[PDB]
Amino acid sequence: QVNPIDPWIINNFVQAPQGEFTISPNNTPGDVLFDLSLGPHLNPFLLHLSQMYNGWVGNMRVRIMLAGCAFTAGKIIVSCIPPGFGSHNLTIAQATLFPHVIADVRTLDPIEVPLEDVRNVLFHNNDRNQQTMRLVCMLYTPLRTCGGTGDSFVVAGRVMTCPSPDFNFLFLVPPT
Amino acid sequence: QVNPIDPWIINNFVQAPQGEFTISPNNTPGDVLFDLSLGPHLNPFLLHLSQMYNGWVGNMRVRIMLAGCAFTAGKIIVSCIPPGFGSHNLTIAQATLFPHVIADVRTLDPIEVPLEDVRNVLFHNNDRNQQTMRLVCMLYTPLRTCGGTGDSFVVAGRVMTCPSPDFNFLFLVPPT
Amino acid sequence: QVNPIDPWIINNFVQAPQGEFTISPNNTPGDVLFDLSLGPHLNPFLLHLSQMYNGWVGNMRVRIMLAGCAFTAGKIIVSCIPPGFGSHNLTIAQATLFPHVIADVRTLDPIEVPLEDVRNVLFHNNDRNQQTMRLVCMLYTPLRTCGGTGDSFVVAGRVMTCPSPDFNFLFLVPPT
Amino acid sequence: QVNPIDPWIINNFVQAPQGEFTISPNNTPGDVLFDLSLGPHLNPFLLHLSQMYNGWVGNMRVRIMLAGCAFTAGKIIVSCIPPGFGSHNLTIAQATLFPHVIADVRTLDPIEVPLEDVNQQTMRLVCMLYTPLRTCGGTGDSFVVAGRVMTCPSPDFNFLFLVPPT
Amino acid sequence: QVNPIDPWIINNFVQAPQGEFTISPNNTPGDVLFDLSLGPHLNPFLLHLSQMYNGWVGNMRVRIMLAGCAFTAGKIIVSCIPPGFGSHNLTIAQATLFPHVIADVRTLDPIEVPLEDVLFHNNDRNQQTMRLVCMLYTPLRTCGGTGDSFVVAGRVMTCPSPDFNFLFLVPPT
């Protein structure tokens, strides 16, 4: 068994670039906040390291934080839609059918998506979009300020990620 | 033993169609918010599958979320009234006598009804209303905004459901 | 084995001098709130005692409290940057890469930084800045009052510290 | 404790950048033509680690290949001088004091430079033209001897500290 | 189950078409000599057998013969390019990162390139296949009587491996 991933990395979560999303009171329910394709490029670590290899296996945990104050109430649905289903047919009711975790903007704790569907990972080359299991978040419930004159408020949100302990790389490639 | 239900389904909760209910400050206490008859048709899954069969046995867990912000205080009573008792005689005090769970609109966590009364399920054909153990929710306590000028606020609520591990189907029928 | 540190000290946390920092709504995200170099001088205890010795080994736990009321939402990043990386290149995204713990201003509980990286401590003389593993805190998320007319509010914060059970002193020196 | 570097590097060699040196006939004896700092940056893969990681411990095994017609006569002197002593004022004789090996430009088998078993001011390594190169019957001054170097890390290399990529 | 190809082909080697490459002293190091993609088309016998079998499995042993006298001094490096990485700007410095074999122009006996052991592949143009390419590692310099142009000629031939076999039968097209 070969594991070139530092044990510290798997035990810590690091913010992913382009993982910053904002929720506004004018966002209609069901609107797509952020649609980031799960992959090693999310973590700043394993992006530099991934240049060594081309094929990778396993999953990667993702957790999201909502920096939302009280007086604003709403729910955000996070669904890991399998590839190919992304189209206008997607709706709030249908989103929950895929694996998901319900989150409240008022929560003061990180939310962890249950992306444990290893389903016997086959292969993932870093040159194709095939089987890029995407993550999409939508405003499950309309956002209201409860008459707190806080219309000019945006619920800032950030997403971190850490590699799974089963993560590994197969083939070596020279750095580009 | 035959269990044609995916183990993932029983381990996950999915929103039920027509399971969206709203609570308004003008709702008098004891008003019926939603009265949905428990059955396989609640879950989007087991509705397509139920077309195969006609008779089903077992119970199905139901949990409700209240997307309510602070500054509004109230309580909602959920009672699984046995069939035949639905009439004007029903009142807030009498509702709690049946199995129930008390919920607070300010709660930030899902509420699970204790619908564990298997009581040796007899049979349930999908052509009759007999023994359709209904679920009714009422405003246990009057809703007040605590002078937060949030009168134009509605506590959005959604209900999910998952099949019980004991759920099963008896007889096969061709799809319609 | 010689341990001249009182067992009570390691089991209790004491406020550190100059460990008071304030967060204002005008603080732009990424601004450095406080940058205190970890060392025995943080704790009022072990400062008088450190006069006896010159070299010390081990780490020291640090926890921070945020005396912040509701209606204000924000996140503060605490990163123990290794020495030599302090410069303009530091940014919010890069800060999380080092060991860190995410904190919410609304939290009502002390936050403990995971400064468990003993990494086989080598030596630390009390006359040089070498390997003075610093602690830096930055406003991870912009601070907003949610229209609560609380602009004239500052989130007071204090930091305590206790010596680790592995803390020890090597060489004796006369008091100065 | 863990070994981030893949074992494939341990059992195989790879050329290093700036390791191109040609023993031109118009070169005075003792002239410097191949100077390396003996650091992790030599191996292309190891250079990649230094971008991410900070602390490195261990040693490599430097291997040198020479292209020889089996006719031209010449020798190269390799001496891994300790850090600090190295400077411009370093005659060929002085380098002979430190550990060294003598190689012939006509040697088919590459020479394995001996390195003592073991960061800043690291141990250095320099090479000079011990003996001038002559065709000896080639009647041509355009001929040159190509030289390539590849460093393979020893099976004890590892890192200590963690740093964001830069 | 039953290997169709006769054992005679296995015991010998066949020159693949367009397997001829030329090395000249005036050719500076940095220009590729020949690009090869492993497949049944390399062996003419296997090329005609593709009609009877759409799917082929196994590997092929590839050997290279280089002709030259004892005066020349040069080295030839054979580099393995993983699929999907080939680029126009393929210099020699990074060409040795992949597994390779060291060879010289003064060799007499043929040198066998080490091929990694290894899934059924259809007859379509599936780019996923082990690619082979050689690069002029060092310049070819003559140490004799100033040869104006001593063209070093080499030939590449491959034969089916013992494990090579066809699994799916398809009538000839």
Author numbering:
A (entry chain A), B (entry chain A), C (entry chain A): 48 to 223
D (entry chain C): 48 to 165, 176 to 223
E (entry chain B): 48 to 165, 169 to 223
From the manuscript:
Noroviruses are single-stranded RNA viruses that cause pandemic outbreaks of acute gastroenteritis. Norovirus capsids are made of 180 identical copies of the VP1 protein arranged in a T = 3 icosahedral particle. The icosahedral asymmetric unit contains three quasi-equivalent VP1 monomers (designated A, B, and C). Each monomer associates with another monomer to form P domain dimers (in either A–B or C–C configuration).
The design of cysteine pairs within the shell domain of VP1 monomers can lead to the formation of intermolecular disulfide bonds between A–A and A–B monomers. This, in turn prevents the disassembly of the particle into VP1 dimers. Because of the symmetry of the norovirus VLPs, a cysteine pair introduced near the strict fivefold symmetry axes would yield disulfides between every A–A monomer pairs. The same cysteine pair at the strict threefold symmetry axes would yield disulfide bonds between every B–C monomer pair. DS1 VLPs showed the characteristic icosahedral symmetry with T = 3 arrangement. Clear densities for the formation of the interprotomer disulfide between Cys116 and Cys193 were visible around the fivefold and threefold symmetry axes. In summary, we successfully designed cysteine mutations in the GI.1 shell domain that resulted in interprotomer disulfides, stabilizing the entire capsid. The resulting particles showed increased thermal stability as evidenced by the appearance of a second melting transition at 75 °C compared to a single transition at 64 °C for the wild-type particles. The lower temperature transition corresponds to the unfolding of the P domain, while the higher temperature transition likely corresponds to the stabilized shell domain. In particular, stabilized VLPs elicited a more focused immune response toward accessible epitopes, and (in the absence of adjuvant) the development of blockade titers was much faster than immunization with wild-type particles.
